[PDB]
Amino acid sequence: MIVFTDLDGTLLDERGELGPAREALERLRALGVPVVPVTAKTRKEVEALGLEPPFIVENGGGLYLPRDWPVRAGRPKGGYRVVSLAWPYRKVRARLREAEALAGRPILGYGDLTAEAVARLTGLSREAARRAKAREYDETLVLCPEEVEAVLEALEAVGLEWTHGGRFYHAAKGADKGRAVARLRALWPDPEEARFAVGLGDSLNDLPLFRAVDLAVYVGRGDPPEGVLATPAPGPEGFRYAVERYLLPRL
Amino acid sequence: MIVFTDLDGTLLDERGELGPAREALERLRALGVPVVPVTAKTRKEVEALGLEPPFIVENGGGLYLPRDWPVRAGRPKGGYRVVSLAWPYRKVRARLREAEALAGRPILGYGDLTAEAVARLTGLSREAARRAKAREYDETLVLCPEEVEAVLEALEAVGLEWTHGGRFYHAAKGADKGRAVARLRALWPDPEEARFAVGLGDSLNDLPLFRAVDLAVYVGRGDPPEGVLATPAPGPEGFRYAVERYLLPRL
Numbered sequence: 004m005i006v007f008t009d010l011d012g013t014l015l016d017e018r019g020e021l022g023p024a025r026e027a028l029e030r031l032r033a034l035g036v037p038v039v040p041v042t043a044k045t046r047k048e049v050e051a052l053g054l055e056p057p058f059i060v061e062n063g064g065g066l067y068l069p070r071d072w073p074v075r076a077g078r079p080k081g082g083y084r085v086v087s088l089a090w091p092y093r094k095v096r097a098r099l100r101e102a103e104a105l106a107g108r109p110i111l112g113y114g115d116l117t118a119e120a121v122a123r124l125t126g127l128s129r130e131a132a133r134r135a136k137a138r139e140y141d142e143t144l145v146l147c148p149e150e151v152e153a154v155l156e157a158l159e160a161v162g163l164e165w166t167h168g169g170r171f172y173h174a175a176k177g178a179d180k181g182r183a184v185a186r187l188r189a190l191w192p193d194p195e196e197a198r199f200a201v202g203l204g205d206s207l208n209d210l211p212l213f214r215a216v217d218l219a220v221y222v223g224r225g226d227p228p229e230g231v232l233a234t235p236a237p238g239p240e241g242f243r244y245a246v247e248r249y250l251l252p253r254l
Numbered sequence: 255m256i257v258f259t260d261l262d263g264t265l266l267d268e269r270g271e272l273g274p275a276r277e278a279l280e281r282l283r284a285l286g287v288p289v290v291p292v293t294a295k296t297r298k299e300v301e302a303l304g305l306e307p308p309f310i311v312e313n314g315g316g317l318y319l320p321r322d323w324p325v326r327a328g329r330p331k332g333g334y335r336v337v338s339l340a341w342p343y344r345k346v347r348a349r350l351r352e353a354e355a356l357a358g359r360p361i362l363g364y365g366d367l368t369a370e371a372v373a374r375l376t377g378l379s380r381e382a383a384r385r386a387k388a389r390e391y392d393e394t395l396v397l398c399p400e401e402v403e404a405v406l407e408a409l410e411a412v413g414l415e416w417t418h419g420g421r422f423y424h425a426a427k428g429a430d431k432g433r434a435v436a437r438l439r440a441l442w443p444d445p446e447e448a449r450f451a452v453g454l455g456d457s458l459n460d461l462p463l464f465r466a467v468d469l470a471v472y473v474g475r476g477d478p479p480e481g482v483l484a485t486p487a488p489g490p491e492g493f494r495y496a497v498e499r500y501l502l503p504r505l
């Protein structure tokens with residue numbers, strides 16, 4: 004069994020911490036069940052949370068593996084090997100400039116904003132905001148509600164893809180949580196361990212995650228997607244509920 | 255006679271340069287008529303143009319005087335003397351945060367953006383964008399057209415004042431081109447010379463300028479505001495026409 008999990012609004016609470024998930028995470032480790040973060044967050048953010056690889060960052064744009072992963076894949080980088088599935092940030096940013104000219108209006112993202120600004124917009128600290136700005140693949144867009152749709156049309160026109168997390172729209176090319184999950188499973192050392200995958204999430208960018216796993220659990224607000232299990236409460240309490248009710252009684 | 259003039263879209267061409275205005279400016283200089291910039295631009299931007307004080311920056315937020323101005327006013331600041339009429343930028347920025355809370359959405363300004371982003375948004379060079387970001391009183395806002403109305407009400411509700419230049423809305427408190435022109439006229443060494451003031455402009459932020467002078471000339475693109483003279487062509491060609499037709503005969 005592998006548990007693939009989104010962070011914001013799923014494993015993490017409103018302050019970007021664990022809440023009741025802590026105990027749930029420990030039980031899984033004790034049972035030897037790998038837990039793989041799959042998030043819109045950057046590697047720098049995942050690191051600051053003390054999460055060890057493997058993990059999937061920037062909506063599936065990058066798969067970070069331990070340097071000594073038993074299956075050879077990716078490009079070595081320090082204590083990691085990195086499998087890049089998506090276009091680099093710089094290329095996305097260049098494409099955004101063309102989308103701007105098309106939309107006939109500015110399209111702003113984290114790359115355009117100071118860390119101070121990103122912090123204010125996200126409620127993160129300036130330092131956490133600096134980590135959120137260290138994007139390798141995916142751009143987080145800052146859009147006024149009323150312009151969203153015109154912007155999305157322009158993104159697609161210039162070859163970019165979009166999704167949204169809990170609060171923000173994203174632009175990237177080749178970043179998909181489902182693609183990344185499928186890839187990581189294919190690269191898993193023990194095929195039997197990866198045979199059954201669970202995926203938990205709460206927003207649009209998690210749909211691909213749900214599709215790519217065997218047991219999908221939605222811990223967001225409202226009704227889950229079709230074919231996805233639900234929990235009584237959202238977020239980390241959802242995660243806890245999910246492990247205890249759906250996972251442990253299988254372990 | 256003193257000629258008070260806006261810069262962008264009035265004295266400056268589309269590239270923000272004085273080239274086309276040279277001949278008309280030299281006509282005034284040769285006749286010993288002082289010319290005072292009155293602009294939304296910052297001290298740094300005005301200096302980069304090689305314009306000497308007295309000049310009025312940031313929509314009237316600051317009045318800059320020569321170090322040896324005969325009438326002692328304001329305080330020494332970097333080789334000039336400055337008379338601060340408006341709240342400092344820092345206070346405006348803080349009150350903007352209250353506005354954001356009321357509006358329920360981000361309200362972005364230059365202070366939130368990198369020089370690179372400002373450069374892209376304005377067409378200024380990266381160097382010029384840094385100068386445009388060196389704001390002491392007034393914030394230039396970057397707003398979705400669809401959100402302007404809600405945003406402007408939010409500004410009013412938190413005690414900020416707004417206006418707009420050729421392209422951008424602004425927020426400040428106590429910055430009014432008319433108030434600054436009146437203060438400079440009152441601090442003028444030669445009361446006779448200041449007795450007859452001319453004001454030229456092309457946008458909303460110039461209405462206060464027109465109210466504060468004895469002869470107002472509009473060089474923007476619409477019909478002129480009531481009580482203001484028009485010119486056959488906008489911008490620097492309008493400024494030149496006004497000098498030749500309205501001012502020289504009077505001199």
Ligand SMILES: O=C(O)[C@@H](CO)O[C@H]1O[C@H](CO)[C@@H](O)[C@H](O)[C@@H]1O
Nearest residue numbers: 011043044045135143168169170171
């Ligand atoms: O789309 C969003 O709402 C979240 C995921 O739900 O990701 C963005 O927002 C987060 C801050 O809330 C950042 O940590 C991420 O890096 C990214 O910029």
Ligand SMILES: O=C(O)[C@@H](CO)O[C@H]1O[C@H](CO)[C@@H](O)[C@H](O)[C@@H]1O
Nearest residue numbers: 262294295376386394419420421422
């Ligand atoms: O409101 C505007 O459209 C113009 C009019 O002067 O000023 C802003 O825009 C200019 C750039 O076009 C900057 O040089 C100014 O500092 C200011 O930010």
Ligand SMILES: [Mg+2]
Nearest residue numbers: 009011012205
């Ligand atoms: Mg989430």
Ligand SMILES: [Mg+2]
Nearest residue numbers: 260262263456
């Ligand atoms: Mg103007």
